[PDB]
Amino acid sequence: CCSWNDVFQYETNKVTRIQSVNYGTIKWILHMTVFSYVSFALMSDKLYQRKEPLISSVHTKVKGVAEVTENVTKLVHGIFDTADYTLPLQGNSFFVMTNYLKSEGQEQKLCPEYPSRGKQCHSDQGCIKGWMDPQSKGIQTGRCIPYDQKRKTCEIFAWCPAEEGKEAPRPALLRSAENFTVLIKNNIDFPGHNYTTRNILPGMNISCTFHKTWNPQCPIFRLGDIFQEIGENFTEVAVQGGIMGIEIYWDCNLDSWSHRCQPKYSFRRLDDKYTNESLFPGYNFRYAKYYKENGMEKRTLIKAFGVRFDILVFGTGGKFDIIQLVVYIGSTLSYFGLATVCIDLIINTYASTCCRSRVYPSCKCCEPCAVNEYYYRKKCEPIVEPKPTLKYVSFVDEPHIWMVDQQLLGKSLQDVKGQEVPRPQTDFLELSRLSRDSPDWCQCGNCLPSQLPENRRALEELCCRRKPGQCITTSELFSKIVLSREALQLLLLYQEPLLALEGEAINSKLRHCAYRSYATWRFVSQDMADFAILPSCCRWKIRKEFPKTQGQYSGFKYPY
């Protein structure tokens, strides 16, 4: 099985070099196109780079103040700075108040609730008892009675008087909260690639303001500009708050030869503009300060509407990795065989006879493509599975050879039908040298009944031709090639120069060589010479020229 010489074996694929401009041109342009697409994808998607998602940290600083005068009994003149509207978070998100309601005497008692649009209840003692409403903050025993002038509400155990249920003002308060300035210091890192960077670099202008075209890299933003860049109106969002999103996209190429790693800023409204009224439309929150005055545990509650800005820092950093390039090249290497596949398809399609039957006469421009057929004769070598039932029979009348692959079921082989096969080119180089008692299944006269078992007798039942005429044995070459004793002796000497030469039982080898000679004569290819069935007239002629004394003649046997 395994030998030391077997290890050092190597197999080269046999090929034939076709000299043609069409095949070479389509080959080269297909190779160039697939190479161009591969390189384009490589340099566009940067598939040679291992990517990694960043890790981000954000620091927000909101600077700006707003004057606002309370509603006139007594009038107030107040100022709002970052200490009040801004929250202690100050990282990755920040709140900018744009409207506020306040209740000073918030304390626990059994007063009613504010009448909303639908909450206006005129019935007396109709409300549920111990309902624990999510709308009104207190658990209620109904006892509905009027505290307003022309309306009423249920008796609630919430913080009183008249805290919830009130709508926001219109126009919005704190309209000066649009020129406020946000400084966003963002620091991103790629730990696998080990590259840390940040938004602000040395030399950046401090007094800049972000704009889409003039100074995009400036990390200083104005809220009005944020809302105007996407067409949003700051006033309606100031009446009822919202949720904005500052997208910071990093597309970082950490390669030194093309190093670029900077952010791109975008803005997107996060809260649903057209949202249901039952759901909480805007972003709001209600917080209070607790205190004890006159012995009563009480508090003061303010509900603030404003815009929450989510700073969404995302991106990807790519760095050259050899393994990714290797995998991509290994994937794309298979496409270079597209040219060979297409050309082989062309050759196999134009080699068929259907192109000569229908295509070439009708089209009349694919006529020179018949050349492809010749390439098929140089590309393919059709063989057949040497089955035991495989047989080959020839007839002088017809030009082709019949492949009788079917099995014998007692019927005479002369009438069995098979697939025609064209005879080979005969290798013209090697060829260029100097009474009526028949079995009734032959058309000639020289046939003879076969002497074999009846189960296997139909194999020898073959004739030299399909219709009556001259027998092939009467030809001039049959006497000279098939059973010319000098010729067979010369052939055997060529195979074994020291043969017995009329010794003991030499006629068997001469008979076998005569069978092989007739086979190679009619069936040129050695694949077809084997598994050939000679006719009875020639078989028994050869047997007469080289009889067997003390034994029967064994017919065709499976060689392999």
Place this chain on the structure above:
Amino acid sequence: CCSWNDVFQYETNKVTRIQSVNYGTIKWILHMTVFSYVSFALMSDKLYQRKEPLISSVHTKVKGVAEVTENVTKLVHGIFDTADYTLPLQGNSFFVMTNYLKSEGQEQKLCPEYPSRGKQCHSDQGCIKGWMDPQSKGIQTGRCIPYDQKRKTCEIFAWCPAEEGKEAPRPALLRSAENFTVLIKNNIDFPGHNYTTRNILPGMNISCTFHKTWNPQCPIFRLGDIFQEIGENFTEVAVQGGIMGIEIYWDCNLDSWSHRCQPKYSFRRLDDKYTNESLFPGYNFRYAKYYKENGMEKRTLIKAFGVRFDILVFGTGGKFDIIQLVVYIGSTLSYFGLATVCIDLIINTYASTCCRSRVYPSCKCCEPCAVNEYYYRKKCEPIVEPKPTLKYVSFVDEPHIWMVDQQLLGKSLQDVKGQEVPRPQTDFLELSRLSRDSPDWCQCGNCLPSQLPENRRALEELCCRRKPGQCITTSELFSKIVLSREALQLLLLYQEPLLALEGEAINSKLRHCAYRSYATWRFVSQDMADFAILPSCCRWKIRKEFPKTQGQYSGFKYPY
């Protein structure tokens, strides 16, 4: 090197088309299986799609209130709404209080600390001085004395009296914080694919509540159902707080023909249930309000235990990309050669004689697989490296040819052993035409010593056979083929019809052609005809028939 015709060269692969049902069947079923697996992986993992992680923004709204009566000197009836237990964050995380302790007279002085289970210290002045305990909030000078009835503690500089060290109540306060409702508005975006969507869509029911089977898409959640869906008990988590996680998974397919992009909700307890007592088991925090009463800078501190719900939004959006499909197809194209590899392995395995020696007689079912061997004869063409030491020698007695690859170290070539090589099929188509003073290393009588340098004399030392007998020169074909002057003249005319024909020094070409004729006679293949070593008898017979007048006979020379 390079020519314009060399660019237009295309090389096809020579093949032989086997007609067999077994090979074709296994080829087609293997191709179908690999194609089916490739398509299955492509459609399941969606490898034709470029994926992208989402960017999310969450907005939480907790609605629900809870009545609770303080411990009875005086009794207090209180209500808790979203203003108190909920925090100002309101995005991506929210706290829901489920237990609380409070201390009103929190002020700075040198009073003792609360006695815990292990913190109970009965020693007198045994505690460390200036220890700065992390457990107790104050730095301690020991001075341990009793302030309780039957227990004592060290003197601490913490906010007093007796704030820390106290356990939580059991049962939990604010047990009504289980029917509380959470509205989670989640807006997600794929910026690379440029697709923004949100949890709540138009037409969704407002009064719905989340359930695993009935209404999963409802973003309204009940706190009790969240714990009950995973078997968690809300009471024990209400006594000592915890951390829950609302996982929102997006598996978005942005292709129009199969567009689906909606969330899936799941719940998972984040804090370790079985955790150490030394570590802080539950989620809690202690915050206060600062105030000045009677001139003393003081505060009131409350420690709240509750459940922190982390809304973990994650997922992936896939969109059709051509480069990913190209890479995947290029990767999977190599698997289509699996059928060819397997069939070639089958052919190369069943071609060896090992299968005929052991496998076929024993098994008796692999008998028809010997046909594969024939395919090997049509697939492979074994050749040998034409080394300078490569030689071929034949013997009329033995049927095979010996490959003497070994080098001559002075030993006679007649006894050198080599690897047997079977003679070819002889190309039957082209063949079907019409006293005792020996060197003592030969076995015939016609041998003669070689006239060459002693260093290179052993090459010609070869005989026509291994054992005594008739010499090959006495054969009938030797006189007709090898040195028949008419035959060699005809061959030379076939190569060059205008030869000198008995002119000056024609015997050299006749001698060379006679050597080639004997080689092709014994060593059929031209690869074996070259590098063949003739015996001394035939060599000197040919030299006698075609002598060299005024020069020595140059032996075998490396042609390449």
Place this chain on the structure above:
Amino acid sequence: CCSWNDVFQYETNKVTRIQSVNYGTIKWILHMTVFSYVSFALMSDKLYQRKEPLISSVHTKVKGVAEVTENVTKLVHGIFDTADYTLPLQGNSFFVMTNYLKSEGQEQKLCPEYPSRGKQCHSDQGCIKGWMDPQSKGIQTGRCIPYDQKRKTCEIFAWCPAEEGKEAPRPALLRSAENFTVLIKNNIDFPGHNYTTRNILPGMNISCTFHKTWNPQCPIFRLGDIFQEIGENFTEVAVQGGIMGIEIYWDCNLDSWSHRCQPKYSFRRLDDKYTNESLFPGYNFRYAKYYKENGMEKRTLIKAFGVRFDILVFGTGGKFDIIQLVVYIGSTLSYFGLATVCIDLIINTYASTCCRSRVYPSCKCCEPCAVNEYYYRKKCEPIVEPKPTLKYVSFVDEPHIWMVDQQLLGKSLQDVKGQEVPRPQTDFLELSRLSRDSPDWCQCGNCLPSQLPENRRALEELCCRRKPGQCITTSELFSKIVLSREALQLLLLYQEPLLALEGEAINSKLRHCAYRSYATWRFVSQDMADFAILPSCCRWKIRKEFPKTQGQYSGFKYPY
């Protein structure tokens, strides 16, 4: 086109098995190298694993207190615990105060601002009116007058007196905030792989402190160590706050046979150390408590500088996926043909005559590589596109055959130049058997003008040799092979043994067979035997031996 037998066809690639140690060695070592690199990349990058990013939840607990004495009119002694400096967030980020300024009587009035380094304004009424400064919290009408001793500031409507503009103390307050301890409980999950784990496991030491080498897996951290591990100074960061980042990297392998999933802790300063003074250098925030005293709505504001620690949890979990392994193997399978490509390149390079002209004589070590040329003769079979203009002509004088691919534009074919082609090896096995009125373009004497249309007359204008001499027709083999009637009759009988044999119009077949015989004689390969152009002398000799009675002689016709 399509047949049931055509489906079961399978094609094996023809190969020739080379027996050489060099080729086998380079093949095997190249295969081993590419296999080793593939396995190394697979086991290093874990490309057989599908990766997934984690989802994290962090819970922070800061323990530690700090004593601090206020500046001495009256002196104060106070303690700071986690209730005050820590924020209610307690998840994924926490604040640790390291400096504080405070203003008690913060209230709204028209007092001036604190004079900074540049804010010191000496002009009288020079400041802008209604400027709404971001620097000072109040909107200002100028009215600049002095309130300090030797300096002045504009009149501001901010919360007064002298809140903003003040620098931080140096040394920093709360220097005891360096031994503070942080417990970080991090729970991570891989939902696609469905694997949940956490930082703390059973059996971990509770009293441990994090160290790089001794106990890295301890999740308890000291704030001083976090700065000392990276060389940062805690005092300068305590004076003016900063931002730190605790990186928690997960490299989880969820395969059971190599299961390891634990965090790695690193620390990185997030805020820019060397940052502009105009920008806010350190991390700080100003918050207040609101109250009413003496009827005035007032507040007390404290500005805190401290370190914000961002717990950046990230990582990746890999789990065995068959599809990823299949894709990777399909990608890397193409590299196994690298050995075949390299060996074919070697064979095609060392097969050219360029290596024998320049390389082998000069180098003298690549001499035995000429053997590769022989492999080319066994690998490649160069053919030519059978164009209509393709022609072949031979001459007895010259040894090679001329390929006349050019078209006939009326010029005589005898003088047309073409590319030389070497004659084949002649298949020595098959060959080893037993007056002055010329056209003036030939050089022999037996030429004759051609009888064809003038447009196609130049095709037959060919001679048997390039220079004068003996005509090829006078050769001895011409009379025996080309026009020996017995030979042609035997050949035709071999093709069809039942020919008419001197019947009606048999001379046409004999003439065609004589043309084919001369072609196969001079042009051995059947590819070159076709498309051959015989000379006028031999052509008209053959026509004289086999005349045509009642018709003209049709010249060479395109067979395909």
